Amino acid sequence: DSQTLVVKLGTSVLTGGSRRLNRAHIVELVRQCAQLHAAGHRIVIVTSGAIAAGREHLGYPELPATIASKQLLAAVGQSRLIQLWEQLFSIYGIHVGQMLLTRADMEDRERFLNARDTLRALLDNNIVPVINENDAVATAEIKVGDNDNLSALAAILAGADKLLLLTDQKGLYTADPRSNPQAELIKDVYGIDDALRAIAGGMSTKLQAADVACRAGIDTIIAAGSKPGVIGDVMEGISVGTLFHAQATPLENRKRWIFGAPPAGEITVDEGATAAILERGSSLLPKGIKSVTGNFSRGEVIRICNLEGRDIAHGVSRYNSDALRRIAGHHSQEIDAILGYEYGPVAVHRDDMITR
Amino acid sequence: DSQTLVVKLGTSVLTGGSRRLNRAHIVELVRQCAQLHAAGHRIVIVTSGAIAAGREHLGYPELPATIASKQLLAAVGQSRLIQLWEQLFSIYGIHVGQMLLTRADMEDRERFLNARDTLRALLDNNIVPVINENDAVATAEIKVGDNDNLSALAAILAGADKLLLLTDQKGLYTADPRSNPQAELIKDVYGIDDALRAIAGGMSTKLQAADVACRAGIDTIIAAGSKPGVIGDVMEGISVGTLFHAQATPLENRKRWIFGAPPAGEITVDEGATAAILERGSSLLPKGIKSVTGNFSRGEVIRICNLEGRDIAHGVSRYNSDALRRIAGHHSQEIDAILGYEYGPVAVHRDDMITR
């Protein structure tokens, strides 16, 4: 039962509050993640703290406290941090891939598909992808976000089963633990309500990310990074901190994604392909394509109809309208010859359409 | 209560029986050693497996099975292994210094003193020294030995309190554990006897090293590398394997070292340094020297006598006879100007002399 887990590490966890990175905690977490990976699970890491790496690499220079200095430090520390991550993960024989993503890329239909394909390839080739925010084109408000929303976006993109948010605190408490001895850590949360938001006054960003993940059908866990073996316990299901149960199911999220917008086009599908899609729930092949109507790009939701014209399914196109028209009615092995490139042997994946 | 601990790691422990180094076990042991170092103790590491590092670095070439190939692989793997040790120890902010030693250097009087000085400087500057055998000028008869005797020699050189020999077995057993369910692990050994040698049939080299270490007053412990927290337990004194108690005391070993060979010279000492040596057991400074007789080199044992001629102490010279003659009666700050170099402010250290 292999599962996909996304781990978010804040700068406070990585540095321990100091000016530099604390590599002992990082290597312990890497050991736990390597155990999980060897167990057969898929791990995706979202990290931060490139500024500390940049400061360390430059010999801690005396720079003015401007956003330009922060951008410079982030630019150097991106490379420095990826190098550190690969050095630490090479101890257990695990390769690391770098991903620089922004929210605008998530919004775009085609860029989302490209990022999903790249991440899926990375995961299928047993490579742990390290995902950070592209600070080259980011703003200060995005910098204050600390990749919290980015973690939820990455979890949605990867289709992960659990999302773990490591922080300094043990999780969510009923009241202030310092003032109230009776204040207790909340264990299970089923619905994020305004009362919970009032209780926790970047914990608010963590709650927002947890709500976003839960609305997509992904369980969210908030725990303390300093807790030993926290990742393994989260993987096993043992309670270590505040848990946010998934409000919906992944199929609901797929329906929401497919039917969120009206179709941008329609294509004609032969009878055999129609039967395969309906009876067996198979993906759509370019051979069964008979006619392409309208104009659209790769990743846009399109309408699928049989020869009779009846709506049979709604799905996401893996090719643009022109390419689909050109490769219609050909064997999947000739797509590269016809187009000069290939996005895969299928026109619409089975998991990417809703049959109706 | 700072103590000096020497850890010996065979190729079996490092590689786990494979063709390549297993870095998970090594990083765990490094974590334990770093905890001990942070606790304030001094750690010296004797390592092997340069051949494995050389094989891995060269892309595993198909070299002929010859001693020349082994020397080739050792030459490359020395640098590769020191690099690996430095990378692993830098995680906890600890620097690593390389030292290559042979038994011939230990036998020599002057080279022993030079190696001791280098190791003492490394230990005083909070740097973990990594000791290996110089395979460029080595022979196969010690290549089969796997640094077992070199570990004891290094323990003697460093003035260590405990010597730990990590191995595959849990230690020493009364009988064969496989054949005899009643066979149990021997916990304490006070005198290495012929019966013990007959019991263990390469445990023989480890027994010889343990005997050599115990004869010099150093406790020897044999344990299993795979045992979790072995180094910490050994440091605390908890029983984890076969323990060989020290048959002698460090004072006895010093007496043996001083009186092992006849004095190679004699020096004359004024009354002030005589009172310093006798009443307080202080070291000897070049100011107190009045006359130097005989020819000797650095490290030779010399005879110390007062103005009358009565013998007061025997000690190990830190300068050769010519240098002592040239710097006699001068302040310690002028040694560098007079000679062009210096070996310290004292002519004979208090710990290298025996008052009588």
Next chain:
Amino acid sequence: DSQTLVVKLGTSVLTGGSRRLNRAHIVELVRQCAQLHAAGHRIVIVTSGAIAAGREHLGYPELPATIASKQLLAAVGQSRLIQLWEQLFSIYGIHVGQMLLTRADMEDRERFLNARDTLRALLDNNIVPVINENDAVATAEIKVGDNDNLSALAAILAGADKLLLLTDQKGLYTADPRSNPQAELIKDVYGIDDALRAIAGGMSTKLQAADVACRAGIDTIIAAGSKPGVIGDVMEGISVGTLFHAQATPLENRKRWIFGAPPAGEITVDEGATAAILERGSSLLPKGIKSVTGNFSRGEVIRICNLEGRDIAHGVSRYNSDALRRIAGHHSQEIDAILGYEYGPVAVHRDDMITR
């Protein structure tokens, strides 16, 4: 026509007088050496400046000006310098190997043979050997030498054709170039006479090294490191600086080495082996051996005589007397089975004997 070249790089050349290594000059020299290596020649590098690398790696600490500090710095600088050398040589796809040597090993009969075998293996497997001085057991007087004599010793050990000593000066001048405008660069030297040592007043160590190398039949060239393409021009025979012609031939040096000491033993050789040795000048195999008389270690010069008893040749034994006695009369492929190790298929190599 492959040739063996030994390049000695002092600390002044490596650092340019600064406190840290200047990697631009080093990478240029590495480019020249890589060109020569790809051309089919054999390159041996004698380096220095470990103290600079140790200072740089430690963050330039405020160590007291003591020899203990120098040894402390060298202990880390050795590893750092070898890492730098391998990084620079890996650009041109050339592997490197570390060899730590002392003059005492060169004086020894057996350690000399072991070092020669290791170096020959390194050279035959297309690996550039980097030779330095073992500072763990070295003295201050050796430290002030700066590997001038070690360079000549390594040149003799490697059987090199040319020894190149890079320095700051352009070469050797008849008079002081600064004071006397007409003072010019001496081009060729045929004998190091008293006048030459009078002219050059640390140039004296370089003259001593050149004398040692030329006495063994190796051409010594003194040039300036900053000169562009100096190594290539030295290889092609162009004049770039003072050249010291070889006073003797390698055959004369071999005779001096063989007949320097009386033979330590004697062996009896078959008539077939006699025919191989006398007419054809071949090596000696263990099959032809019948009786070994006397006790000797590996590397000792022994006497070879036929069955009737007359001397035929004197050579250097590759095995000790006991091993030769045990393996005499067996095929060369059984040596490992008989002894548990081997030093090669021949008992006395052709180049290590003088037929008479």
Next chain:
Amino acid sequence: DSQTLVVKLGTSVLTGGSRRLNRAHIVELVRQCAQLHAAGHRIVIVTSGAIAAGREHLGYPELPATIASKQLLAAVGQSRLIQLWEQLFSIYGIHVGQMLLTRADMEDRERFLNARDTLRALLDNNIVPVINENDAVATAEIKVGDNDNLSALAAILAGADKLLLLTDQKGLYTADPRSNPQAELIKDVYGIDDALRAIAGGMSTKLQAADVACRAGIDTIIAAGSKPGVIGDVMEGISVGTLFHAQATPLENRKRWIFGAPPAGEITVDEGATAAILERGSSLLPKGIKSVTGNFSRGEVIRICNLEGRDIAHGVSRYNSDALRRIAGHHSQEIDAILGYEYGPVAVHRDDMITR
């Protein structure tokens, strides 16, 4: 949704009725299997016809028609056929492993476990295992069986989802197709009854194997080898021939396997391990073992009880009683050190007990 499919190929299918193997059909089936493997599935191949390979390799000698000749031909053709299979599978970059199994081995408790572990390793390392019957120790009656029962045994061992029995005929017919034009191929069979046995008079062996597989909870399909794309259609679920539905569930088969015999021993399990087994259904670790009672070998079903002695589960031991006693209470990484070998880090796998 990866699935494990076992394909059995008879001699008639491989040779097409000729004296020699017909490699065109074999390479077509290999192409289909390679497509399935690249799709992410697991394939196990049971083959025959080694006698034909032996005849072809020996140049078709004129041997007497005795069982000894057939045994010799099988002995040569085993190697020849494995070589042919690996050559054909290397075209698509798939490695092939050979396993020789007999029914008596499956009957043994320990040999069954060893074979299962070997097959699981082969499948997990993406290697197609080719399974045949060891004809060296087999009898003539076993030879007439044509690996039909062996195919079902291998399917049970691998835990396959479907079993395909290629044959000359299209499958099972209601009547004789030649005599009766109204005779039709039976598509689905839910229970093998005596009427079906009477209908088909080695088709009977095929029915026996199908019944054995169905009673184990594995679907059995009988089709014609000459049918194009038969394997792909079979795995996709398209009907191509007689289908035998699974009478029982895999959990029923596991219960039958576990409770077939009374436990041969009992062990004591700590409270934490008891909670892990009960609450989470995890496997048993050697650390949680507290006492081993009775004598048993690896693979035997044993009784698991908590500290209170209550019977909590029944499972299959991966180690013998002596090894379990010796390694009880130790961390899994020390099993190899204690025993000299390791059967895995767990005592009993979670799939290998029934919690009660």
Next chain:
Amino acid sequence: DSQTLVVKLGTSVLTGGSRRLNRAHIVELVRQCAQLHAAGHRIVIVTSGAIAAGREHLGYPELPATIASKQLLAAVGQSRLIQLWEQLFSIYGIHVGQMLLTRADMEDRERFLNARDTLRALLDNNIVPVINENDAVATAEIKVGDNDNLSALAAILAGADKLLLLTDQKGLYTADPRSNPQAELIKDVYGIDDALRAIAGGMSTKLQAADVACRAGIDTIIAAGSKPGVIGDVMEGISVGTLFHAQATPLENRKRWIFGAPPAGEITVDEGATAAILERGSSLLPKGIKSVTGNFSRGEVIRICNLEGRDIAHGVSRYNSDALRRIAGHHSQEIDAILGYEYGPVAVHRDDMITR
């Protein structure tokens, strides 16, 4: 004077201590075996090292150190090693047959007979049988045995005259050759005793195999694989290593085998067959069979009595009781017609019977 020889080659001999098979040594040994085969003798080869072949074929993958990995490697190395053996033997025009056997097969009465018949057919058709342990169903303790006991079992099965065990050492030594120069090679051994077992400490397995072979009346020789022409000298009779003379005679071994267990049945034999058995020592034919009493399987020891009921001989049945009952009193040419198969033209072979 044709003789049968069994040669056992350990992994150390095959690989020379490296990670891969050294084919020069193997081809030399194959050349010697081919010369012997051409001379008219019979050769049986027992080999190991499938793990090395599996590692080489799979591109030396990085597998975890577990017995599962060893089984995975062996599953491919078996085919690779058989292919290598047949490739090397085809140079001299000799075919090779594969035989996978285990000790349990030797224990079984009928499997022993089947293996003996297969091996006899292979030998009679000038095919060298290559024998290895079936690692699919083997245990770790079987792997550590290195086919030593299996070699003796195969020698017993084949009825070989000599058994040759190639090893790294030159043979059995009175004392340690390294420590004691007076230690010499024990040329002849007539009885394996406690002192011999104490002298040699995997030499113990070799001694056990030699004892087993000697008690069966087969000479055992331990020599060094690297020795040139060892196989030819062994066949000729030259002393190349420790020789273990046969303690018993083949007739004694046959009597021990026959009378090891009481007869499982009895048959009635006509007077002509009785006369042939007693006077001429001929084998028993199905024609002379008069009655079959009791039930038994092929290979079981049965009791032979004449018409009067007097016991005449004890032998081993080549058929089961039912088959003998069915074919009793019929000609040998009709056995195949009656049974559909034939185990030979005789009921009990003369060499398998003991007249009494």
